[PDB]
Amino acid sequence: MTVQDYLLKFRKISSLESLEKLYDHLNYTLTDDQELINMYRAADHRRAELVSGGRLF
């Protein structure tokens, strides 16, 4: 419990809508490269994981 990475919160996200929200939200908060570099990895992982995971009907 010695880590406070926002990536952990993104992983819990299931809806893609939250993606654009978490970005504009975190991007407006600090507006630093930190959230920019994190949102990029999380967004890519979530998108790649969903597409390279299992299609739902």
mmCIF file of C-alpha atoms in Angstrom:
data_model
loop_
_atom_site.group_PDB
_atom_site.id
_atom_site.type_symbol
_atom_site.label_atom_id
_atom_site.label_comp_id
_atom_site.label_asym_id
_atom_site.label_seq_id
_atom_site.Cartn_x
_atom_site.Cartn_y
_atom_site.Cartn_z
ATOM 1 C CA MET A 1 0.000 0.000 0.000
ATOM 2 C CA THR A 2 2.886 2.344 -0.808
ATOM 3 C CA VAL A 3 1.643 3.387 -4.247
ATOM 4 C CA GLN A 4 -0.904 5.961 -5.415
ATOM 5 C CA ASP A 5 -0.947 5.456 -9.186
ATOM 6 C CA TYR A 6 -4.126 6.607 -10.932
ATOM 7 C CA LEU A 7 -3.652 3.671 -13.315
ATOM 8 C CA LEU A 8 -5.199 1.491 -10.609
ATOM 9 C CA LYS A 9 -8.447 3.458 -10.821
ATOM 10 C CA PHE A 10 -8.451 3.276 -14.620
ATOM 11 C CA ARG A 11 -8.159 -0.515 -14.530
ATOM 12 C CA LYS A 12 -11.408 -0.684 -12.561
ATOM 13 C CA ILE A 13 -13.102 1.310 -15.324
ATOM 14 C CA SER A 14 -15.196 -0.898 -17.608
ATOM 15 C CA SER A 15 -17.078 1.678 -19.680
ATOM 16 C CA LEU A 16 -15.208 3.448 -22.480
ATOM 17 C CA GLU A 17 -17.165 6.629 -21.733
ATOM 18 C CA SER A 18 -15.281 7.059 -18.455
ATOM 19 C CA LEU A 19 -12.090 7.079 -20.535
ATOM 20 C CA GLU A 20 -12.802 10.465 -22.120
ATOM 21 C CA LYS A 21 -14.039 11.714 -18.746
ATOM 22 C CA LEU A 22 -11.025 10.559 -16.731
ATOM 23 C CA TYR A 23 -8.801 12.171 -19.361
ATOM 24 C CA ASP A 24 -10.440 15.603 -19.481
ATOM 25 C CA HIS A 25 -10.834 15.426 -15.700
ATOM 26 C CA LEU A 26 -7.236 14.509 -14.874
ATOM 27 C CA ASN A 27 -5.976 16.618 -17.780
ATOM 28 C CA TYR A 28 -7.751 19.661 -16.335
ATOM 29 C CA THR A 29 -6.731 18.989 -12.730
ATOM 30 C CA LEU A 30 -2.934 19.085 -12.927
ATOM 31 C CA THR A 31 -2.632 19.314 -16.714
ATOM 32 C CA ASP A 32 0.796 17.694 -16.405
ATOM 33 C CA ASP A 33 2.480 15.053 -18.564
ATOM 34 C CA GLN A 34 1.964 12.537 -15.747
ATOM 35 C CA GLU A 35 -1.752 12.075 -16.436
ATOM 36 C CA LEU A 36 -1.046 12.364 -20.161
ATOM 37 C CA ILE A 37 1.436 9.484 -20.078
ATOM 38 C CA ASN A 38 -0.837 7.446 -17.806
ATOM 39 C CA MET A 39 -4.075 7.999 -19.727
ATOM 40 C CA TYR A 40 -2.225 6.925 -22.873
ATOM 41 C CA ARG A 41 -1.102 3.605 -21.396
ATOM 42 C CA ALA A 42 -4.382 2.922 -19.597
ATOM 43 C CA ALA A 43 -6.444 3.888 -22.643
ATOM 44 C CA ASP A 44 -4.321 1.681 -24.898
ATOM 45 C CA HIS A 45 -4.335 -1.239 -22.462
ATOM 46 C CA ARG A 46 -8.102 -1.058 -21.968
ATOM 47 C CA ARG A 47 -8.695 -0.758 -25.713
ATOM 48 C CA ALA A 48 -6.196 -3.501 -26.555
ATOM 49 C CA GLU A 49 -7.396 -5.706 -23.698
ATOM 50 C CA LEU A 50 -11.032 -5.433 -24.784
ATOM 51 C CA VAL A 51 -10.252 -6.052 -28.454
ATOM 52 C CA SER A 52 -7.718 -8.754 -27.592
ATOM 53 C CA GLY A 53 -9.851 -10.242 -24.831
ATOM 54 C CA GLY A 54 -13.384 -11.478 -25.383
ATOM 55 C CA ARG A 55 -16.240 -10.030 -27.424
ATOM 56 C CA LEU A 56 -19.497 -9.679 -25.490
ATOM 57 C CA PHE A 57 -23.025 -9.989 -26.880
#
